Every structure is written in structure tokens, then in C-alpha cells.
Amino acid sequence: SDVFHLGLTKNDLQGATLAIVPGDPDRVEKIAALMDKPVKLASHREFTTWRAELDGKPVIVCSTGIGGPSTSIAVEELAQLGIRTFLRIGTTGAIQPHINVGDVLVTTASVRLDGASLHFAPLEFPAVADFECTTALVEAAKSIGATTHVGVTASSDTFYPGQERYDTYSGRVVRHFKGSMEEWQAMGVMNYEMESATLLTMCASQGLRAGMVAGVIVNRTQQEIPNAETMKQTESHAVKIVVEAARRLL
Amino acid sequence: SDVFHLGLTKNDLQGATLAIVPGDPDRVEKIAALMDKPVKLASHREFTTWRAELDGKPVIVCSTGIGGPSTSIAVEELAQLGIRTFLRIGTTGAIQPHINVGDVLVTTASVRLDGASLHFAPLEFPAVADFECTTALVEAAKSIGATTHVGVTASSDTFYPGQERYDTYSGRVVRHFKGSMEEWQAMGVMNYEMESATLLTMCASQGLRAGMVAGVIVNRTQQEIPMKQTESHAVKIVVEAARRLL
Amino acid sequence: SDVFHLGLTKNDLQGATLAIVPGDPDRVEKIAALMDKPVKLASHREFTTWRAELDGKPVIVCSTGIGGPSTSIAVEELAQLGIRTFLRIGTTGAIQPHINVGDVLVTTASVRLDGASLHFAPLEFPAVADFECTTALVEAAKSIGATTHVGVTASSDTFYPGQERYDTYSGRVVRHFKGSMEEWQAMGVMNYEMESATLLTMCASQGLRAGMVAGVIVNRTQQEIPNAETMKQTESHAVKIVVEAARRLL
Amino acid sequence: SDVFHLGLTKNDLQGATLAIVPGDPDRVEKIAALMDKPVKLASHREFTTWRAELDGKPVIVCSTGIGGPSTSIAVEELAQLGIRTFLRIGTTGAIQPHINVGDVLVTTASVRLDGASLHFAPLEFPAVADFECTTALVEAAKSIGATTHVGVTASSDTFYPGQERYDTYSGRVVRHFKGSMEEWQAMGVMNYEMESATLLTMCASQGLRAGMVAGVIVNRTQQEIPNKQTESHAVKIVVEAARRLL
Amino acid sequence: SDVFHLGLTKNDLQGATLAIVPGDPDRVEKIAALMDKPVKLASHREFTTWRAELDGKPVIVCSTGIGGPSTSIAVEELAQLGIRTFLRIGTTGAIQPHINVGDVLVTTASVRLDGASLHFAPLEFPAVADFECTTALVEAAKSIGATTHVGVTASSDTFYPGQERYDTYSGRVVRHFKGSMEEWQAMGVMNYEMESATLLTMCASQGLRAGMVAGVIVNRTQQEIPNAETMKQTESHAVKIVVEAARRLL
Amino acid sequence: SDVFHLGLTKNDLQGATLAIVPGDPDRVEKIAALMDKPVKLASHREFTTWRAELDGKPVIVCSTGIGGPSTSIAVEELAQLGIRTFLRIGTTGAIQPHINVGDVLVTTASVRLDGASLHFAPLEFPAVADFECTTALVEAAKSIGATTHVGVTASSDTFYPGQERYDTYSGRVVRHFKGSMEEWQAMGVMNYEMESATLLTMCASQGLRAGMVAGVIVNRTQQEIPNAETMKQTESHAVKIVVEAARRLL
Ligand SMILES: O=P(O)(O)O[C@H]1O[C@H](CO)[C@@H](O)[C@H]1O
Ligand SMILES: O=P(O)(O)O[C@H]1O[C@H](CO)[C@@H](O)[C@H]1O
Ligand SMILES: O=P(O)(O)O[C@H]1O[C@H](CO)[C@@H](O)[C@H]1O
Ligand SMILES: O=P(O)(O)O[C@H]1O[C@H](CO)[C@@H](O)[C@H]1O
Ligand SMILES: O=P(O)(O)O[C@H]1O[C@H](CO)[C@@H](O)[C@H]1O
Ligand SMILES: O=c1[nH]cc(F)c(=O)[nH]1
Ligand SMILES: O=c1[nH]cc(F)c(=O)[nH]1
Ligand SMILES: O=c1[nH]cc(F)c(=O)[nH]1
Ligand SMILES: O=c1[nH]cc(F)c(=O)[nH]1
Ligand SMILES: O=c1[nH]cc(F)c(=O)[nH]1
Ligand SMILES: [K+]
Ligand SMILES: [K+]
Ligand SMILES: [K+]
């Protein structure tokens, strides 16, 4: 291994400069499966890496796990190995009433409710996605059919209190986040997830290209916790779109 | 008049929903003169407004003056009048050595070195431009063949200390902004200007579309204080972008 | 031209060291007319500069525009040309029920709800007026018999949300400023305006003298948008005070 | 499944109230095997959970993953299922010259260089460990004869910039963290790791007991470098401490 | 005299490395008298210093006054004189319904609602007690059979608004501290006092050992102001404990 | 006693609405003795209270102790008892080269390097002195011939790291305050002391009048620790001025 965590050498990448980066290690194989010559490279902790081939060019799929910290490790080490473009494919909860479960969201920029982004740039720096990556995701979504929404996303270091969930061990939310969901809602924010603030800030401040798309598995104006019955369908929908977007970015 | 500062009514807009917003009130006539049936509506303080027509649809050009505060007045009061799309056209000084005088900068999002943005959303909220607006500015720049950089802009409430200029009365820069140009340079920030953090934040947080394009008049890796076929180029672009957004 | 925005030279000033700084460019001519030999020097963007004479000594009257940012440009560039004393004359919205339209308010120090002041001193530094300038403004007011209040002012980068106005496009106010008017009120803050925190802070932190006076055109305990027909007898009452204070400061 | 991420029922736990929480899911089975009747319960993402038995009583072993975010999910969902004591076990790298490889660090409290802790309490709230848990860990380490340090740990949301590592892609560290390691060293901070600020804050602010213990495998200040013995040393200590807290 | 505020020389200490540091200067003689060979060393301002002997070893008792600022002076200057272990014994207000007046509260760490702690470490640093000092306090309390609680303490730069007292001249609390007692209560915070955040932060940030014990004189779940007649005996309970803990740390 | 800490009743004050508030309890008798009919009222902790008479009116002299916290207690409890005007008299280290030992400094406003002021108003609020108290202190200084400076004061919760002293047990200053003295000095700040940020902030946000004056006992461009062999010459100069200012404010 050339890096401390991922268990990868520059040779393993075979000249790849683009990585699809899902949160879930089990999703890595599914994403590689839509491409050619899918091959497992390594798996340590929450970091599972495959390589595949897209229009004859080598591409990396590598899981981040949940959160900015492990995301920050995966992105840094991939970048040491030569990755310059990063596409997160995730799952998300919508907070707007018109955004349905199954919809696909493309994040232009993120509300930074994380700590890791601050380790790369002060809060005033925008967690903004790369224009070409964002353009690639929107055009990709259009071409495969999805009902898509394009906008700002709130990116939180927690699943529970930072996304104002109250059905929890304690039933309470710290003052800073009490009433917060309603305010992001009034501000047109589309959804919550957990990694994009870190990804987007660390790439935009180090000359790396990054994009972000997620599939809606729950609407927070209905429920706190996602239903299981439609999660899998939504996941494959977003995965199809990220793979197609990668294709226009080679 | 239906608004406190601009001196305009809903009627005066004639159904306009898009406004091009330069900083200099003296630039407003020049921009409107590129469009059809240009007409001065009003000027009070730093806010000079003209109406024109672009492809037979009414369009507003209205100056913001320098800074987030006057900008925030103009955007709010235009929004009360029916404006939903704001395209800023500016001048700017680049901080990256590969960016030449002449060049055009389309801003995707801004470093919020301002105060007014915080009156709409806390610092964590991104001062991000609307995607259709940015797309339309990039495509308009490609249409007239300007060399274009797309990225992040540092938006400062001062011309001097916030942009780390030392050639001043006091000659010093407060600790917070000491070494700051260097940091933004290494983070790939393209340029300094003074209104986009306010504009983009207030619009992104209230359902209004905004975009920013500027022409480069100086590179800070040479000089501190600022071939004018370039302000011309940027005005041509913002107009062409407005056409695609109507 | 010796400076980048104002369009002025050191010679234009004729050795002036005091400038009266209104916000509105269309007020500059009016203030210069209470003085001797008023002449227009320059007019660029929102910066109209005239020069007049007071007890035989040259004096600048120069508009700042709305906001700390354009105010910071005017004060700095005037300071490069030799101005050491700055007297702001403004209009303002009072937030105390005992302060009436027509009253004159002299500002001892300002609540820093602006961005530009931070570019000169950290938040903890007091946006405090120079003691001599305040003295001269208070004594000028007393000498023309104006009903005067002396205290703290809240200085906001916005006209609308930062002064907790709700009669707006969005109808709402960000968490940080919700309930804020009532807090400032209970703390004895006299009024809202938009430039004093920047002026006073940048002056007090750089060896320059500054003072602030303003006429009350509305009272926010009954109205948001000022009445149209009390912005004439008030504007001129406050202008006379700042011209008379200028005399006592030369 | 009673909880969304971990894939566990209350019944899976069999009345367990104590969880040993390593970071690496691949270490869960090993720590479980050191006790009686080890049984796998689930595995999803980075959360691998085994149940085991310690002096006749049911005990949980569950990985958090790297970082406060995933840690906060594991802890919350385990708490819903009835866990009231969490003992963090890991390996780490010291930043003091007097701390040697093979030594054990018990953490009284952490410097909060993370984001998740703030979601449970404002920054002024101390990321302190529970006194009973900390005592059990110290007594456990003494009883097997480890060379031990008891003190403050800095808990970072990054492995790289937050621990002032410069051997990176960019090779630079953001202003805020520049000079930070030297400050923490002068302040007596023993080490860096990435989960304890979130674990200790969220537990101490919700009436749950938490402690942490770690083996030192590496030292930043030291040269030359060594090198499994230290991993199994700290694990024996956490297991013996769990024993005292049942 | 070797230090500017306390009026002491190293020689006055006679090799002492441990000080008991109460808040009130009138309490110092009381604490010294429980030990052997009690001798007054000095008294300037709020700093009264006595020396005594404990199991044959010299020991300092020195008052801090109220507040982190003067606490930081006494601790810094006693440290220059060779003190390495500080044990604060104080009075305190419980905010939990199970805690009684007369009870002994041992602080593991404090919520830093103070200013002086920041002058030694940024806010993210834990105001945590030394493990040996805390251990000695707990065991000392157990040995005399005092009813004791161990946990987190809120340490406020004020007695009134920072501890959310409304029975005051103004009768109001700044928004930052409105509803704050309730949040600390829900977070399991035992109590309020005024010096521990400063003491514990400066000591832990400089390699000095510190411990914090205090007697409860009021419960804030029922009333703001402590009663008169029962304060004298609560004092005697935590004073026995802080002296006994001192014995275990020599 | 009507108040918890100070040990005073309303009747002890005899209608007094003005208090002079030194930091040092031992200085209270000194100050009262310049006036008529001085009598000790009470002494508890660092709060020593005397009452005297100035041109026929009763006046209070009451020590604050060192620091914002105890200062906040004395001002609150005196305000409950009817005090509306507070004049602090203190000692101070000058940080400008032209300001000498023996000089008198009148503070117009303070840099808030304290914690207690935040418990009354957020940081943006200016710790500004009252205009009448300041005017009276400056004119009082003029009438007795003292060499006087009027300006901003840095008000710190510590004597040592917060005023950037390095001659200490640890020998380091925390990142936040490293180089800070040179920056306050460049910003025109005259001096360091420890109570005025709290006093002035808490009074200006509650409708109480406060003034601040101090004698310079050390110059920091030369020396960290004040030299005792020039301190009692300078203390009695400033005491004279505050008593004369109080006369003008009755
Ligand atoms: O499904 P993934 O990609 O993990 O995406 C999202 O969901 C996780 C939480 O359930 C977080 O990782 C979040 O950002
Ligand atoms: O030419 P405009 O649009 O004013 O743009 C830019 O230049 C001004 C300063 O010279 C600032 O207002 C800045 O943003
Ligand atoms: O009338 P001037 O002096 O601009 O003063 C005030 O009014 C303006 C808003 O109408 C702001 O500029 C405010 O501070
Ligand atoms: O009685 P002491 O030891 O001072 O302790 C406590 O009470 C004082 C206020 O009543 C503060 O000093 C507080 O911390
Ligand atoms: O001499 P006094 O009034 O205490 O004033 C000053 O000096 C003390 C420190 O020596 C602090 O109290 C400071 O502000
Ligand atoms: O972080 C999240 N991931 C997935 C979700 F459905 C959600 O609501 N939040
Ligand atoms: O804010 C700025 N505007 C215009 C410029 F040329 C510059 O450098 N900075
Ligand atoms: O900034 C302001 N200027 C003038 C006003 F009347 C007001 O309310 N606010
Ligand atoms: O600081 C405090 N000391 C003593 C008390 F009783 C209290 O409530 N607060
Ligand atoms: O707070 C202070 N008091 C007195 C001094 F001489 C000094 O420097 N600082
Ligand atoms: K302006
Ligand atoms: K993780
Ligand atoms: K004190």
C-alpha cells in the first residue's frame, strides 16, 4: 500500500483520475457492475475499492463510510494516487414538500454543518460543487429520465440532532439546531445528508473537481425514518445517473 | 413610489422579471443602450435604474452602488417589484497569475468576507450562484469567445484591508486578514470583488436566481491599484446571458 | 487623481483636514451652502465631493453612499489626502418610544452589526466616537436648541432584516436577527442606521477623529417605512448642528 | 430491526447495558472472542456488532467506524436498545516525547476538534469521560501492569490537516490549524485520535457513561520507528475494565 | 516580595507544593486551623494567605476572590512560588432536584462560561480536573461519609444573568443565557459556580494538578437566593473533605 | 442586609445614587477620607463599603475586587440599593511610549477581552462610558492640572497572558493573544486594565451611568511588573480626580 488506510498502490489505479465515492461499502460493487471489467482492489475498514472501465478508461469506485472524517481520508489518499475528479452518490432525506421519495437531487453547494470542512477552509469558504461535474450530473439525470431537483443541501455531522430528529434516546435537540430544519426549509434547502460539505469544500479548496447527487429515501415533512420498501429502487436509480455522469467527465 | 430607495413602481417595470445589476450608476445607461427601446426610469443616491427590452421582453438595469448594504437594498426593492433574476456585471482584480487582464470570470460561489450576507443566512450557508444563471453566463462567454475562468470569488466588505492592500494611510492590515490573499490564492480563489457574497447569499436563501460575471482590470500579483475592450466584453456577455434566461 | 475612487488630488483639498460625510450624494451641495465659497471638486459613483470654507479654513463635504463598504473607501482615500477628522451627518430610525421625529441623536458608540468594521479591528474593539467630536456635536445641538439624545446606536449592513423589518419580499428574518430590535431596545439603543460602526471603528483604530449625528425621520415603535413629509425640517436641523460642530473642531 | 443503521433488535442484546466500541469493524470479532459465548448479530456499513458474555452477563461489541458522525449513529442506536456504558478501545499515536510505544493512554477528557460534539452541546461543554469508567480503566491497566498515562486527548475530524500532517497531496494546512500541534504539546495533550470528542460529549450530555483507553503503536516526535502486542494489551485492559463496570 | 499581588516570597511557603484555594478571604483562617502550626503569611486585596502543616508537610491556604480573573492571579503567582497542586473548595448552587443543600459536589470538568480560561486555551480544550486530585476528593468524601455527587459544573463569569437569575435590578437576561439553565439541567450538569473553568483550564494547560469540590448552599430548581442560617455548616462539610484530600496528594 | 454579597441595606446608603468603585478594598478608606463624614458600612469578601458626604449629599465608596465577575456583583447589588452612577478608579499599565508613569487615563470605551460583559450584551455592543461621566472626569483632570490622555482601553480577564506578559511560570502566551499587545498599540489603545469592559458594558446596557479613570503605574514598552517605588505618588492623583468628578455629577 502507498497510503495509510485504503490499501492501494498507484499501480492498482492503472492511470485512473476519476473516482465514484458512495457512502456505503456494499454499494461499491453495484456501481462497478454497471461498468466493464469490474475488479475488487481492496477492503479495509469502511473503505472498499473496486476498479472498472468506462468507454475504455479506468475508473475507481471507493466507499467513504458515513461522515466527513472518513470521507476526508478517502479523498486525500485517492488524490495522492492520482484521482482528480470525485462524484459522490448518496442517499438523502428531502425537507421540501414537493420533493418525493425516488427523486434525484444534484447539489450545487452545501450548508456546512460539519467539522471536517473547517480543517481545509474557514466557514466563509463556499462548499461549492465543480461546474462541469454538476453539469454532468444534471445532463445525466435528464438523459435517463429521473425527476430531478437542483439546489443547496444541508450537510450534517449527525443523523439525529443535526437533522432535527426528535424520535431518539433523549427526545431533545440542542439549542443551536432547534428550529433549524424549518429555517433551511424557508431558505430553499432541498435535503439533508452527511458527507457533501466535507467533500465539496476539500476539493474546491485544493483544485480537485467534485460533484454530488443523492437519491431521496425519505421526506421529513412526512416521517423521520425511511421506509425499507422503496430504498433499493431509489439507490439503483441514482447509481445509474452517477455512472452516466462519470462518462461525460472522462 | 412603491419602494423606499429606488424611486420606482411595479408599473414602471412593465412586467420585467430580470434585472442586470452593475455597481456603477454611470454604467447603467451603457448597458441598457445595447438593448431595445432604452428608457431612464429613476436615479436616487447610488441607484440609477433604466428599462429596456431584450427579444421583446422588458428588462431592468439598476445600479447597486459599492458594497453589500446598498446591494441588499436594491435587490430587496426590485424583488418587491417582481424581479426574480439578478445578473451582476462587475469589474475585478484577479489574484491568480494565469488569469490575464482582459479575461472574464464567472463566479460559481463566493467566500463571504462581508456582513450583509449574515443578515439572510448564517455563515455556513453557501453564497452560491444559481445554476441556470451560471450556465447561461458560461455559454454566453463561449458565444463571444472570451477566455473564461469559472470558480470561486472572494467578496470583501473593504477595498483595502479585506483585499490585503498595504499601500494605505495606516499601512497595516488587521491580524484576521494578514496573509489572507496567499491563503485564498492557494485555495484556488480567482479574484476579489465586493458585492457577490451578499447578492448570491440573499438570492439563494429567498428563491431568487442570481449569477455573477466580471471583467478583469488588474492582476494583483503585479500591482495593487488598477484595453477597456474588456468591460465591453463582459457587458456583451451579461446581456447575452440575460437573453437565454428570459 | 491621487486616489482610485474619489477622483481627487491633495491640491484639490487646499490643506483641508476636516470632512463632513453625509450618505446621500444629493445632500453634499446642500451642506456646502451653509459655508463660504462652495465649489464642486468631483463626482464619481456615489462619491460627490465639494469644498467650502469655515472661519477661513478649507473643509470637505463628501458623500459615502449607503453602507460601510463604500464608507470605508471614502474615509481611507480622504485620509490619504490629509483628512484627520470625519463628521457623519445622517438620517435614522429611532427604536425608543420617547425619541420623536425631528429629534437629533448624537452617537457615543455603535453596535457593530456590519462587516467592514471587522476589517480594521476585531469585534471586541469598541466602535466609539472621538471624545472631542462628540463634545462639539452635543454642544452644537444645545446651542441651536434642538431636542437631543446621546447614546448608543445600532449600525446594520442591511436596511431590512438587520433592522428587523418584516414588510419585505420574503416576510421573514434570519434566526440571528429575530427578536433583535426588542433586545437592543431593552439595552437602551436609540436607533438604527447603516454606516457608523464602520466609520467609528476604522477611525478609532487608526488615529483619526470621528463623530456621528443624525436627524430622526421615523419611529419604529409605530412604523417601518418613514413618512414622506418630515424628511425636510429634520434633515436641515441636523445639517446645521454638524456645520456648527465642524466650526468648533477646526 | 428496531434501529435504522445497526440492524439490531432489543432482543438481540439479551439485556446488555455495556458496549465495547472499537473503530474497525474487522476487530469486533477478535475482542468478542476474548469473552464467553461470542455470537455475531449483524453487519451493515461500518457497524459490525457481536454479543458476548462476561462473568455470566451479556456484553456488546460494536464498531463505530472512523469519525464522530458514524460514532454518533452507533452510540445513539445502541442507547435506544438499552446500552448505558460505552468503553472506547483503540490504538493511537502520541505527540509527547516521554510517551513510548507499548504504553496505554486513558483519556480523562478531549479537545473538541470535531463537528459532531457540537450537535449535542455547545463548545464550552467539556468532552469529559465518566469518572467510574475512567477509574475502572486505570485500575485495569495497573492490574495487568501496563505503563500508563492519564490525560487529555485531542480529537480531530481529520487524520491529516487536523493533526497538522504536511506529508499530503496539498502539503499545506489551513490557518486555524497551523501551529496547533505545538500548542497541544505545550498544553500536555498526549495524543490525537478521531472519535472521543463526539463519544464523550454525547454521553456526558445525555446521562450515559463513557471511557476510553488506547495502545500507543506510533509516536510523531520519536525516531527511529517501531514497528499486535500493543493492540491486544489495550484490549485486555478494556475487557477487564468492563468486568468492573457490570 | 517575589510576586506582585499576593505579597509573598518563596521562603514564606517553606517548600510547600500544595495550596487549598477557597474563594472567600475570611474562610482561609478557618481552613488553616484544621491543620497544624497555622501561621498568617499575608493579606492584600482579596488574597489572604496562611501557611500550615499537614502530616508534617507545609501547606498553603490562599483565597482567590470571586471570579476567574483574580483566581488566575493567585494560581499564577503561587505557581511561580512553587505550588504544583491546587484544590479549590467553594460554595455552589445546585440545579438538579436530587441534590441537597449541605451536599458535596466534586467537579470532573466544567462548562466554560468564563473569559479567563480562554486566555490559557481555546474553548475546545476541556476544563477537566486532574484525575489524582478528583480521586482523592471522592475517597476523602467517602471516608467521612458525606453525601456526594460527582459530575460536570457550569462555571459562570457572573452570579446573576450567567446563572439565569431574574430577580435583579433589570429583571432580564441577555438572549445567549435565556433558557440556559434548562439546557444545562437536561445535560446532567450538577451546579453553578464561578471559578472552576478558569482554575481547571489554566492548570491542565500548564501541567499543574487541580481539583474542585464545593458545598451546596441553594437549590436553583426551587429558589434563586441562598438562605442565611444554614451556610455555616455546609462550609464545614466540604472543608473537612478538601483538607483530607490534601493529605492523600502530599 | 437586602443583598446577598455586599452586606448592605437601603438605609445604609441614605439616598445615595452615586458610587465610586475602586478595585482594592484597602483603597476605599483612602478615598472616603477625601470627603466629609466618612464611615465604614461593611466588609465582606473583597467588597468593602464606606459612605461619605460630598457637598451635602451622601456618596458610596465600594471595592469591586479584581475582575469583571466580582465587579458585576458589586454593581448589580449596588444598583438594587439605588446607585445609578458608577465611577471606577483603578491602576493601569500604559502600552504607548508617550504615556508615562504618573499619568491619568480616561477611558471612552474598552476592548472586551473579558467574559462578564457577554453575560449582559453580545460582543458587538460597545463597552462605552457614559458621556456625562467621561466629560466630568476629563474636566476634573483639567481643573487640577494632571497630564491626561483620553481614549480606548483594553480590558482583560487576566493580568498575565491576556496582557501578553511572558515573565511567568510557563513563559508562553496562548495563540489568540500572541502579538496582541503590539496590535492594540498600533490601533491607538492606551492601556490595559481588568474591570472596565464589564463595568461599562453592564451599565450602558441597563440605563446606569458609568465612568472610568486610572493612574498609570507601569509602562509596558519598558517593563512587565510595576515598580512599587512610584505607585503611591500616582494613586493619590487619580483618587483626587474621581472625587472631583463625582462632585460634578451629584
Ligand atoms: O447512503 P450514503 O451514501 O451513506 O448517504 C447518506 O446516508 C448516510 C446516513 O444514513 C450518510 O452517509 C448520508 O450522507
Ligand atoms: O465595477 P463594480 O460592479 O462596482 O465592481 C467592483 O469594483 C468596486 C471597487 O473598485 C467594487 O464595487 C467591486 O465589486
Ligand atoms: O441618510 P444617510 O446619511 O445615508 O443615513 C442613513 O439612511 C440610509 C438608509 O435610508 C443609510 O445610509 C442610513 O445609515
Ligand atoms: O464561596 P466561594 O468559595 O467564593 O464560591 C462561590 O460563590 C461565590 C459567589 O457567591 C463565587 O465565588 C462562587 O464560585
Ligand atoms: O488597582 P485596581 O483598581 O484594582 O485596578 C487594576 O489593577 C488590577 C491588577 O493589578 C486590576 O484590578 C486592574 O484593572
Ligand atoms: O443523512 C441522511 N441520509 C439519508 C437520509 F434518508 C436522511 O434523511 N439523512
Ligand atoms: O474589489 C475590487 N474591485 C475592482 C478591482 F480592480 C479590485 O482589485 N478589487
Ligand atoms: O438606516 C436607516 N435609515 C433611515 C431610517 F429611517 C431607518 O429606519 N434606518
Ligand atoms: O456561584 C454561585 N455560588 C453560590 C451559589 F449558591 C450559586 O448559586 N452560585
Ligand atoms: O491590569 C493591570 N493593572 C495594573 C497594571 F500596572 C497593569 O499593567 N495591568
Ligand atoms: K454604497
Ligand atoms: K465513518
Ligand atoms: K475578585
Side-chain angles (χ1 to χ4, degrees), chain E residues 23-24 27 66 88-91 159 193-195, chain F residues 4-5 45:
Chain E
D24 181 16
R27 188 143 83 240
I66 296 159
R88 173 165 145 76
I89 182 263
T91 57
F159 191 80
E193 51 79 69
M194 295 180 69
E195 293 81 29
Chain F
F4 187 60
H5 290 98
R45 305 173 163 272

Side-chain angles (χ1 to χ4, degrees), chain A residues 188-238:
Chain A
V189 174
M190 291 186 307
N191 61 320
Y192 282 115
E193 55 80 67
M194 297 186 71
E195 294 80 34
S196 73
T198 295
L199 177 64
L200 296 183
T201 303
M202 75 181 287
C203 286
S205 77
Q206 291 181 108
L208 304 162
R209 305 194 306 163
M212 167 74 188
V213 64
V216 178
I217 55 158
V218 75
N219 189 294
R220 298 296 310 280
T221 72
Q222 295 184 139
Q223 334 178 163
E224 288 196 13
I225 298 296
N227 295 327
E229 91 124 358
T230 188
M231 264 162 72
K232 251 130 208 326
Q233 193 199 328
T234 300
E235 185 179 50
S236 299
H237 198 27

Side-chain angles (χ1 to χ4, degrees), chain A residues 4-5 23-26 45-47 65-67 69-70 72-73 76-77 79 84 113 115-116 118-122 156-162 167-170 172 174 177 194 205-206 208 225-226 231, chain D residues 4-5 23-26 45-47 65-70 72-73 76-77 79-80 84 113-116 118-122 156-162 167-170 172 174 177 194 205-206 208:
Chain A
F4 197 92
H5 295 94
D24 189 354
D26 296 302
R45 303 173 165 269
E46 56 253 67
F47 317 110
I66 289 168
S70 50
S72 77
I73 287 163
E76 166 59 26
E77 294 187 1
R84 301 288 177 267
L113 310 179
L118 300 168
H119 294 215
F120 299 92
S156 174
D157 265 357
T158 53
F159 189 74
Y160 294 96
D167 185 30
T168 57
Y169 178 62
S170 74
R172 13 170 258 92
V174 77
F177 291 111
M194 297 186 71
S205 77
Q206 291 181 108
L208 304 162
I225 298 296
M231 264 162 72
Chain D
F4 187 62
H5 293 90
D24 191 348
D26 288 333
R45 300 166 170 278
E46 55 255 63
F47 317 106
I66 291 183
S70 55
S72 68
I73 285 165
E76 165 56 33
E77 290 181 17
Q80 287 185 34
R84 304 287 175 261
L113 309 179
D114 71 320
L118 294 166
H119 293 213
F120 302 90
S156 167
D157 259 8
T158 60
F159 181 82
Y160 293 102
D167 63 338
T168 50
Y169 175 64
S170 60
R172 73 187 145 73
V174 78
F177 280 104
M194 304 188 50
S205 67
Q206 296 189 91
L208 305 165

Side-chain angles (χ1 to χ4, degrees), chain C residues 175 178-179 183 186-187, chain E residues 172-176 178:
Chain C
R175 181 208 290 274
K178 264 200 91 65
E183 275 274 285
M187 289 172 190
Chain E
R172 56 176 289 282
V173 172
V174 78
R175 127 215 292 276
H176 189 71
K178 274 207 122 216

